[PDB]
Every structure is written in structure tokens, then in C-alpha cells.
Assembly symmetry: C4
Homo-oligomer: 238 residues x 4
């Protein structure tokens, strides 16, 4: 335990955290420069080793963090993420992974408390949304099957495959070129195609708008519940 | 009644409901595989009979459910839907109906209580919206007549018909290519066409945004009404 | 006054109002049929006189309504609208006005109380919005001048004129093809054009979103003010 | 101080402020006329000197305002803006600045209290949003690096440069032609490009919607906090 505590004061120190963040920022700046072919020609050698050095340091950090937090490390989503991102960066270049290495810049989120809280807040609406997500996904899936069967033969790029219909349906949901780009061309062969896509647009839009309304109103309901109980206690206690 | 109760314990049992859901899911998976021409070549025979078997089972289920619920079955929207969807699936292939058969996967909504509640919640805003829907539809109808008269002769695809103008107006509402795709071309012949479509976009957008604002605020009003009465009773009772 | 009251019981009767609405609906149906060249060939003669008859009746109605309400008629926006729309319909065909005649179908709004209330509610947010509308319009006006000067020479269709720049800026606000259709082409000649349109998109979007947030929140503030005073009175009276 | 007060009664007078606003409006009208080549041919000489006269007056005003407010002038954002805009207008034409001169029409905002308040209100949400803006910007930056590396070689116009990828990513966020214009073309070479842009669209949309929800709900929380304390005091005092 003497050893354990020695490294624990380091890993827990303000300086340790600041250093890592410093590195994350430097490496973030570096990753953008590596975008310039000009810059690389001149200083690519400098940068590649700095990336190996940062990742070496980040690996020492994850290791030390694990000896400190023990099992609590892998029950922590933020630490898992730092693990998974640093580990990606450790797979040798010998291709998609080379690009995923830049995800280690999200470590600037996992290391900065203000950013953690933002992401925690945003994520917290999701668990209550899961069933609505399930229902929407079932909706897409049913309509994707139908679209593939109705239109996949004459419009294979957009509907010849369940995957392609899923993609197209998502495009229609975003309303991106849904009429000039998809439904009008479809209607030149299938004049009733509008009977398929208009209702689909109504549902997907109605559901999303009403999901937002429910989140706002149902939160106010809770807010009103919390303060209603506090007031009644003062009425009751006084 | 002995007979009646025997089948009522079945139809009402946890196992009965789970089985049906199992089938709905299996059949849902099956319907997606039937999308692959490759898969069909190999196993289409297997799948077609499984669809006949599932639908046979689903028909036995609807029948049994009707002997159990009697008149209460047809006063239930969820049961009507299961009826109407299973009945569609019973029309012989000898074409649009073949595709509508996939609607029986929405039965995964009518059989799962969590999903029912979602749809019930979303639907519940609609009755209060009917008049606004009526007003919007009257608005579309008037403008569709006008557009057909103003532009249908020189732009028949987009406005030559009341139906076509309805479709185009819906496209403009979604803002999909309204300017580059419709109004700018229109303005090459009718330079004041913007006087028609800009105001139309303002109204349709203003109305929809303000419908959402009213739903949120008017709900809070009710929320505040409910808790205002509860507090006053504690002030009054205490 | 004997005479005056005789016609006042008519104009105020349930039957009188229902009749007019009946006519508005019939005439509305008629206006849609007149869209079909086929229908007109066969029954155009029938319909044109029915339109003259309805408008004759509507003119008798406005007249009678004025003898009844006297000065109160022209201080009523709904009645003014019925006046202005029926008067349009009275200008002889000997062209844009022929199309504006269909506005008399909005009379179905001015005659149906449910519809009046909808429009009243929606309109009621506007007076508080006037200054924000003014600020947005000033914003457009300034940017339209700038765009005309920056881009009107090389892109006259989109920016050669203050009016054209106003139109284009509105298109960009709706986000319709703003990048592929306008800014990317602009950037082939003016590579910094993004410095103009991106900020413009940020402001217009930020302002509109925040106008909606303010309306919702400021209404809740009032709702909370009203119920806060009611509760305090019960605390104070009890 | 005698001198100081003499000019202070002027600069602070209702008449002084009204005059400036009068000029701002006249000059605003003038700036729009200067857009017409026809108008300029006839009256350009008139207008150019009127612009020199207005700016001369506006310079006298800023000067006088500074002798009056002393150090308080440069600690005032509204006054800084009037300074910075009038100063721009003072750089001799001997080009982008000639266009920036029209920014002096925003002085109609800095001089009209109603407009000041609007802008103050809208701006006031921003300080609390800074971290979310930072997180979104980090998000863009990471994805821009990735896009440049994944697609910049085969699609240089859209992704060959970190700047170009930033621009394209912003376009995708606005959903402008994201599928037909960018991702579908990308997918003809990179069939998994959807794995990159769909999630990107989900995050950016989820974050913005949820930022709006949080602003509305967190404001209500405060509203409820303020009135909860007022009620409890009446319960407690009474
Ligand atoms: C809770 C809601 C359910 C969520 C549904 C999730 C959506 C699943 C999408 C799977 C996409 C499959 C790959 C793809 O898109 O390409 C199509 C392939 C290629 O066809 P090919 O064989 O090349 O001709 O052809 C195929 O592979 C089509 C076969 C796909 C069957 C997948 C079944 C998923 C089970 C969904 C549960 C349904 C419950 C009712
Ligand atoms: C309003 C509440 C939330 C609403 C969101 C739910 C709606 C579902 C949206 C689905 C997203 C669109 C899926 C998509 O783009 O492609 C589906 C894939 C692609 O198959 P594939 O054919 O391989 O690729 C497209 C064709 N190709 C190769 C030429 C490009 O093939 C597939 O079938 C894959 C199946 C993916 C669907 C499951 C995704 C749901 C997760 C989203 C929940 C996130 C919560 C925040
Ligand atoms: C909840 C679900 C709501 C969404 C329901 C989906 C209905 C979509 C219907 C539109 C389908 C469509 O436009 O095209 C498919 C069929 C067949 O095209 P069709 O024009 O008949 O044949 C063309 C022949 N060809 C290839 C040689 C040129 O086109 C037709 O045959 C037109 C038939 C229209 C039937 C629409 C009936 C609405 C079903 C809703 C049932 C209640 C749920
Ligand atoms: C409460 C708001 C009212 C809601 C309005 C509902 C909208 C009705 C749309 C009906 C669409 C008719 C079929 C269509 O779109 O194609 C146009 C056809 C073909 O012309 P064609 O004869 O082939 O030359 O030519 C026609 O069929 C045009 C004749 C259509 C007349 C339909 C009248 C609906 C009554 C609306 C009540 C008006 C109240 C003021
Ligand atoms: C903001 C509150 C809600 C706002 C929604 C209300 C606005 C109304 C939107 C109307 C939807 C657009 C209708 C449409 O796309 O086509 C109208 C049909 C088609 O006629 P048709 O000429 O046969 O087909 C188009 C031409 N063609 C054959 C070459 C394709 O011909 C017709 O005239 C049919 C008439 C359909 C209008 C009635 C639909 C209103 C129900 C929507 C309410 C849903 C509540 C959630
Ligand atoms: C409170 C915010 C102010 C609201 C501003 C309202 C916007 C006014 C738009 C007027 C549009 C004029 C007609 C048009 O668009 O075509 C451009 C014409 C044709 O140029 P042309 O002579 O054919 O060469 O060329 C022109 O006519 C350009 C001259 C237009 C001058 C209009 C001045 C409006 C006063 C705005 C107050 C400014 C306060 C700072
Ligand atoms: C977020 C809060 C609300 C935001 C809305 C305020 C933003 C202002 C939007 C302006 C609307 C776009 C105006 C427009 O499209 O054209 C402007 C006109 C047209 O001039 P013109 O050159 O004759 O026509 C275009 C060129 N041409 C002939 C080839 C087509 O030439 C003009 O300059 C006319 C000036 C019209 C601007 C005044 C309109 C403001 C009223 C909107 C307030 C409605 C409250 C609900
Ligand atoms: C609040 C207001 C916020 C909005 C401010 C508006 C700034 C817009 C600046 C973008 C202007 C632009 O891209 O084009 C105009 C100039 C001239 O083009 P330029 O590329 O220099 O000349 C092309 C020559 N030619 C025709 C023979 C090919 O292009 C340039 O010269 C580029 C110079 C960029 C200056 C941007 C400085 C930001 C001003 C913000 C001041 C604070 C307020
Ligand atoms: C808090 C979130 C961070 C906010 C990030 C702000 C975004 C910075 C964008 C800077 C854009 C640079 C100019 C540009 O876009 O053109 C690309 C140039 C031309 O390449 P070229 O040399 O002509 O080949 O090639 C380059 O110049 C690429 C090199 C740009 C490196 C900029 C590094 C910014 C530091 C961000 C902090 C990262 C923290 C993890
Ligand atoms: C939902 C919460 C708010 C979300 C907003 C935050 C998302 C960030 C949006 C970024 C805006 C898009 C930037 C952009 O359009 O270009 C980036 C510039 C341009 O580089 P450049 O290559 O020179 O020009 C484009 C290529 N060219 C020359 C052929 C046109 O090259 C750069 O890299 C410049 C870096 C600009 C990014 C920093 C801007 C963040 C400030 C926005 C916060 C405003 C608060 C209201
Ligand atoms: C009822 C709806 C729609 C699904 C449905 O079941 N109908 C879904 C959408 C997302 C859920 C919200 C978020 O989770 C955040 C938060 C969690 C708290 O726990 C309770 C309050 C709140 C505001 C939830 C209420 C909201 O309304 C839920 C139940
Ligand atoms: C007043 C407006 C616009 C129409 C109008 O009449 N103006 C319409 C739009 C939809 C309606 C809402 C939904 O129905 C859900 C719910 C039903 C409850 O019963 C009362 C509360 C609430 C939130 C309704 C209030 C909302 O405001 C209604 C009256
Ligand atoms: C403060 C903002 C933005 C302008 C500004 O001055 N900042 C503007 C936008 C439109 C206005 C709302 C609507 O008028 C409807 C209603 C009228 C009541 O009278 C007071 C409450 C309410 C909800 C108003 C509050 C809202 O906030 C106003 C003052
Ligand atoms: C919590 C979120 C998201 C960031 C995060 O930290 N999670 C951010 C987004 C913008 C912020 C709002 C605005 O600033 C206006 C206003 C300022 C007051 O001071 C407190 C209330 C209010 C409504 C703020 C609450 C809101 O929720 C903040 C904290």
C-alpha cells in the first residue's frame, strides 16, 4: 500500500490532470496540422513521433489509473472510453483505425468536468426515450420493407435493398429533397407514391415534435410536483 | 360457460400473449429476409408456408379473442386494428395487398403495453388539434385552387391540377426546394409569384410553431391549475 | 325602428348564419370543380351563374349586416374582411382579381366561431412580436444592401437588386439550397462568401429559436404570477 | 465644468437623440437608393455628400459623447459599437470596408431602447451556452479532421481541406442537400460513408433540440423556485 498510495497522489493530483489535458490539446492542435500536406512535408517527422509520445504517455496514464481505481475503473463509462480510445490508437497502422485515432481528442471531454456534465445532461433524456426510439425504428423497418417491395425493382439505388430503403427513408425524414429528388421521380412510374411518403412524413414529424412537447411538459409536471410538496409541508407545518 | 371459461383462461394467459408476440417477431424477421432475392431463391418455400402458418395462428387468435370479448372486441381500436390487419393478410395474392400484409408487424405495437401507451399519448393531442387541422386544410384548399388557376397552365406538372397543387403546396410547406425548384422557375414567367408563396410559407410556419407553443403553454396552465387547487385546499383545510 | 328590428331578427337568427355557411361550403365545393377543364366544359354555365347568385346573396347579406350593425360593422375586422372579400368578388372580370375571388372561402373562417377563436389565438402573439419583426427586417435590409453590393454584379439573378437579395436572403433563412445552390457557387468567385452567409444563418436561426423560447417561458412566468397571487391570497385570507 | 455641462445637456437631450435617429433613418433610406444604378446616375452626387455629411455629424456625435461619458464610454458595448461602426465609415475608399459602412444602420438598434432590450434579451442566453458551443465546436473539429482524412482525396471540393470539411459539415448540420448532394455521391466511392454522416446528424440534432429543451425547462425551474420562496414566506409570515 505504500507504493499504491505514492502513485495515487500523483494520479489524483491537479497537476497530473492538467498535464494530460495539456497533451490532449497539443495533440488536438497537432492532428489538425497533420491535415495539411504542406505542413507534413516539412514537419511530418516531428509530428508522428509526438503522436507516439503522447500515446505512450496516455498509455502510462491509463495503466496508472487502473492500478489506482482497480475494478472501479471498468465500471466507469468515462474511463472505459479513455481506455477504448487509447487502445484504438495502439493498433499498428499496418486503415480505418488510423482515422479513428482522432477520437482520442474526445478525451478533452472525459477529462474536463464541465464537459462531462454537459454530456451527462444530454444523455439523461435518452433512457426515457428508448421505447419511442424502438417504436420509431419498428416504424422505419416496416416502411423500409414496404418501400423495397413497392419501388426497389424500378428504383434500385433508392429502394432495391432493405438497407437502401432505410437510408432513403431517413433522408425523407430529414425532408432532404424528399419531393424533387425522390417522390416526384417515383410518381412518374407510381402516381400514388405520395400516398406512401406523405403519411410517413406526417407520422415521423408528428412523433418527433410530440416527443419534444412531452419532454418539456412532463418535466414541468415534475417541477410542479416537487414545489407542490414543499409548499404543502409549509402550509402543514406552519 | 364452461367452454367459454376454458378458452378464456387461455386467451388471457401470459403464455398466450407471449406466444403471439414471439410469432410477430419471428414473422417480422422473416418479412425482412423475404426482401433478399438471394435468400428467397434458397428458402422462399420455407418462408411462404411459415407466413401461411403464422397467419393461420393469428386467425385462430382473432377468432378466439372474439368469442372471449364478444361485443367489447369491436369497440376496441387495438383489436379492430389486429382484425383489419389480419384480414388484409387473408385476401389471396391473386397486388397492393401483398405489400400491406407487412402491416401485421404493427401488431407488435398492439400487443406490447409499453408501445400502446406511447401511441395513446401521441394520439391524445390530436382531438384538440382537429379544428386547427381543419383550418390548415381549408387554407391549403384555397391556395391550391388559386395556384392551379395562376400557374397550372404554364406549369402543369406542379399546378395543372388541384391535386398537383395540393402536393406542391405541401412540398413548399416542408420547404423542400421551394425556391430553386419551384418559385424561382415560376418567377421566370410570373415575377410576382413570390407574393403568393412567401406569405403562404409565413402562415404555415407561423401556425405550426404557434400550435406547438400553445400545446406546451396550455398544458402548463392546466398543470398550474391542478397544483393551485391542491395548495389552496391545504391552506384552506389547515 | 320597426323595420330595423324586423331585419335584425333575421340577420341575427341561427338560420341566417347557417344558410350563409351552407352557401360558403357549396361555393367552396363549386370553386374546386371549376378547376377541372372537363367539368367546365359540361357544367361551366351552371356554375358561373351559381357564383353570381351566391355573390348576389352575399352582397344582400353584407348590406343587411351593415344596416343592422351600423358603425360597429366597420370597426369589426371579421366584418371588414367579409366586406373586402365580397367587394373583390364584385369587380367585373374585364385578371388577378378573378383569382382573388376564391378568398371568399375564408368567409368560412369569419362565420364559424371555432375558427375565429383559432385565428384570434394565433394572431394574439403578433403584437408582442412586432419589435422583433422590426429588428429582423432591419437585419434583412442591411444584409440585402450588403449582398447586392458584394455579389449583385457577378450574380444578378440572386443579388443584382435589393429585391432579389431580399428574396435570396429569405431563401437562405429557410435553408433551402443555401449551400449547394447559392453559397458554394458564390464561393467559386468570392471564396470568403461563407463569412457573410454563415453568420447570417446563425443570427436568423438563433433569433427565431430564442423568440419561441421567450414566448413559452414568458407565458409560464405570467401563469406562475397569476397562481402565485391566488395562493398568497388564500394564505393571507385564511 | 461649465463647458462640460453645456454640452452634456445637449448630448443627453431628447432632441439630440431624435436627430441622430432621424439621420440614421434618412441614411438608411439613402443606402438602399444607392443600390439602384439608375438612381445613382441621376443623384449619386447628391447622395455621396449626404453620406459624408451624416458621417461627419456622427463623428461629431461620437466625439461629444466621449467628452461627456469619459471612461464610461469605452466600457459600454453599445457605444463601442457606434464607435467601431462610425470609425469603419471613416477609412477612405482607396474595398470590403466600403460595404461594411452599411453596418452603421445597426446604429438604429444601439440608439432605440426597445431594440437594445431585444438584443440584450437574446444575447443573455449565450453566456450559459458557451460550454455547449465549445463542445459542439470540438465535435465539428474532430469530425472535420476525420472527414478530411476519409474523403478529402477523392472529394477535394467538399473535404480536401480542414476548412472545406468544416463548411461541408455545417451544411450537413443544416441538412441542406446532405444526402443527394454529399453523402450519396460519397457512397458511390465509400459505401459506408453513411456510418459517418448519419450519426453526425443524430448528435448535432439531438444536442440542439436538447439545448432548447433544457433552456425552457431550466428557466421554469427558476421561475418555480422564485414563486416557491414567495409563497413559503407568506405561509411562514402569516
Ligand atoms: C424493434 C424494431 C426492429 C429493428 C429493426 C432493425 C433493422 C434491421 C436492418 C438489417 C439490415 C440488413 C443488411 C441490409 O440492410 O442489406 C440488405 C440485405 C442485402 O440483400 P441481398 O442478400 O444482398 O440481396 O438483405 C437483408 O439482409 C434483409 C434481411 C434483414 C432481416 C433483419 C431482421 C431484423 C429483425 C427485426 C425485428 C422485427 C420485429 C417485428
Ligand atoms: C424520433 C426518435 C428517433 C428516431 C430515430 C429512429 C429511426 C431509425 C433511423 C434509421 C437510420 C438510417 C439507417 C441507414 O442509413 O442505413 C441502414 C443500414 C444501411 O444498409 P446498407 O445497404 O448496407 O447501406 C446503404 C446502401 N449503401 C451501401 C449503398 C449505402 O442498413 C440497416 O438496416 C441498419 C439498421 C439501422 C437502424 C437502427 C438504427 C436505430 C438507432 C438510432 C437511435 C439513436 C438514439 C439517439
Ligand atoms: C399505416 C400505413 C400507412 C401507409 C400505407 C402504404 C400505402 C402506400 C400505397 C402507395 C403504393 C404505390 O404508390 O405503388 C404501389 C402500387 C403499385 O403500383 P401501380 O401503379 O399499381 O403499378 C405500376 C405498374 N408498372 C410497374 C408496370 C408501371 O400502387 C397502387 O396500386 C396504388 C394503390 C393505392 C392503395 C393505397 C391504400 C392505402 C392503404 C392504407 C390501409 C390502412 C392502413
Ligand atoms: C374543410 C376544408 C376542406 C377540405 C378540402 C379537401 C380537399 C379536396 C381535394 C379533392 C381532390 C380531387 C381529386 C384531384 O385532386 O384531382 C383533380 C381532379 C382532376 O381534374 P380533371 O377532371 O381530370 O381535369 O379535379 C377535381 O376533382 C377538382 C374538384 C375537387 C372538388 C372537391 C371539393 C371538396 C369540398 C371542400 C369544402 C370547401 C368548403 C369551403
Ligand atoms: C399544421 C397542422 C396540420 C397541417 C396539415 C394539413 C395541411 C393539408 C396537407 C395536404 C397533404 C398534401 C396532399 C397531397 O399530397 O396530394 C393531394 C391529393 C393528390 O391528388 P393527385 O393529383 O391524384 O396526386 C398528385 C398528382 N400526381 C397523381 C401526379 C401525383 O389530392 C387531394 O386533394 C387529396 C386531399 C388531401 C388533403 C386532406 C389531408 C388532410 C389530413 C391531414 C391531417 C392529419 C392529422 C395528423
Ligand atoms: C425598419 C427596417 C426597414 C424595413 C425595410 C423595408 C425594405 C424596403 C424594400 C424596398 C424594395 C424596393 C423595390 C425593389 O426591391 O427593387 C429594387 C429597385 C430596382 O432598382 P432599379 O432602379 O430598377 O435599378 O431598386 C430600389 O428601389 C432600391 C431602393 C429601395 C429604398 C427603400 C428604403 C426603405 C427605408 C428603410 C428604412 C431604413 C432605416 C435604417
Ligand atoms: C423571425 C421574425 C420574423 C422574420 C421575418 C422578417 C424577415 C423579412 C423577410 C423578407 C421577406 C422576403 C422579401 C422578398 O421575398 O422579396 C422582397 C421584395 C421583392 O422584390 P422584387 O425584386 O420586385 O422581386 C424579387 C425579384 N424578382 C422580381 C425577380 C422576383 O422586395 C422588397 O424589398 C419588399 C420588402 C419586403 C420586406 C418586408 C416584409 C416584412 C413583413 C414580414 C412580417 C410578418 C409578420 C408575421
Ligand atoms: C455583423 C455583420 C457580420 C457580417 C459581416 C459581413 C462580412 C462579409 C465578408 C465576405 C465578403 C466576400 O466574400 O466578398 C466580398 C469581398 C470582395 O471579394 P474579393 O474576393 O476580394 O474580390 C474578387 C475580385 N473579382 C471580382 C475580380 C474576382 O471579399 C473579401 O474581400 C474578403 C474580406 C473578408 C472580410 C470579412 C471581415 C468581417 C467583417 C466583420 C466586421 C465586424 C462587424
Ligand atoms: C475547443 C474546440 C477547438 C475549436 C477548433 C477551432 C477550429 C480551427 C480551424 C482552423 C482552420 C485553419 C484554416 C483552414 O481551414 O484551411 C486549412 C489549412 C490549409 O491547408 P494547406 O496548408 O493549404 O494544405 O490547413 C490548416 O491550417 C490545418 C491546421 C489547423 C490547426 C488548427 C488547430 C486549432 C486548435 C484546436 C484545439 C484542439 C483541442 C483538442
Ligand atoms: C448547437 C450549438 C452551436 C453549434 C455551432 C458550433 C458548430 C461549429 C460550426 C462551424 C461553422 C462552419 C465553419 C465554416 O463554414 O468554414 C470554416 C472555415 C473556412 O475555411 P476555408 O477553407 O478558408 O473556407 C472554406 C473553403 N473555401 C475557401 C473554398 C470556401 O475554416 C475554419 O476552420 C474556421 C473555424 C470556425 C469554427 C469556429 C466557429 C464557432 C463559433 C460559433 C458560435 C456562435 C455562438 C452563437
Ligand atoms: C412519456 C414520454 C414518451 C414515452 C411514453 O411512454 N409515452 C417519455 C420521453 C422521455 C421521457 C423523459 C426523459 O426521460 C427525461 C425525464 C426522465 C424522468 O425520469 C421523468 C421525466 C422526464 C422529463 C421524462 C418524461 C417523458 O415524458 C418520457 C417519460
Ligand atoms: C387552443 C389550441 C389551439 C386551438 C384553438 O382553439 N385556439 C389547441 C391545440 C391542441 C389542444 C391541446 C391538446 O388537445 C392536448 C391537451 C388536451 C386537453 O383537453 C387540454 C390541454 C391540451 C394541452 C390542449 C390545449 C391546446 O391549446 C389545444 C386546445
Ligand atoms: C420579450 C419578447 C421578445 C421581445 C423583447 O422585447 N425582448 C416578446 C415576444 C412576444 C411577446 C409575447 C406575446 O406577445 C404573447 C404574450 C403577450 C402578453 O402581453 C405577455 C406575454 C406574452 C407571452 C409575450 C411575452 C414575450 O416575451 C414577448 C414580450
Ligand atoms: C444546463 C444548460 C446546458 C449546459 C450544461 O451545463 N448542461 C445551459 C444552456 C444555457 C443555460 C441557460 C441560459 O444561460 C439562460 C439562463 C441563465 C441563468 O443563469 C440560469 C437559467 C438559464 C435558463 C440557463 C439554464 C441552462 O440549462 C443553461 C445552464
Amino acid at each position: 500500500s505504500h507504493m499504491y498510495l505514492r502513485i495515487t497522489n500523483i494520479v489524483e493530483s491537479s497537476f497530473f490532470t492538467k498535464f494530460i489535458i495539456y497533451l490532449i490539446v497539443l495533440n488536438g492542435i497537432t492532428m489538425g496540422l497533420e491535415t495539411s500536406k504542406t505542413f507534413m512535408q516539412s514537419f511530418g517527422v516531428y509530428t508522428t513521433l509526438f503522436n507516439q509520445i503522447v500515446i505512450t504517455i496516455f498509455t502510462i496514464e491509463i495503466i496508472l489509473r487502473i492500478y489506482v481505481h482497480r475494478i472501479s475503473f471498468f465500471k466507469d463509462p468515462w474511463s472505459l472510453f479513455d481506455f477504448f480510445v487509447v487502445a484504438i490508437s495502439l493498433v499498428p497502422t499496418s486503415e480505418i483505425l488510423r482515422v479513428l485515432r482522432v477520437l482520442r481528442l474526445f478525451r478533452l471531454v472525459t477529462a474536463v468536468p464541465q464537459m462531462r456534465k454537459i454530456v451527462s445532461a444530454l444523455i439523461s433524456v435518452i433512457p426515457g426515450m428508448l421505447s419511442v426510439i424502438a417504436l420509431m425504428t419498428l416504424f422505419f423497418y416496416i416502411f423500409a420493407i414496404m418501400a423495397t417491395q413497392l419501388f426497389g425493382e424500378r428504383f434500385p439505388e433508392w429502394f432495391g435493398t432493405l438497407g437502401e430503403s432505410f437510408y432513403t427513408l431517413f433522408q425523407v425524414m430529414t425532408l432532404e429533397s424528399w419531393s424533387m429528388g425522390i417522390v416526384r421521380p417515383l410518381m412518374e412510374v407510381y402516381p400514388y407514391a405520395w400516398v406512401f411518403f406523405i403519411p410517413f412524413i406526417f407520422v415521423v414529424a408528428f412523433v418527433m415534435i410530440n416527443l419534444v412537447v412531452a419532454i418539456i411538459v412532463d418535466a414541468m409536471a415534475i417541477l410542479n410536483q416537487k414545489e407542490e410538496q414543499h409548499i404543502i409541508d409549509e402550509v402543514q407545518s406552519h
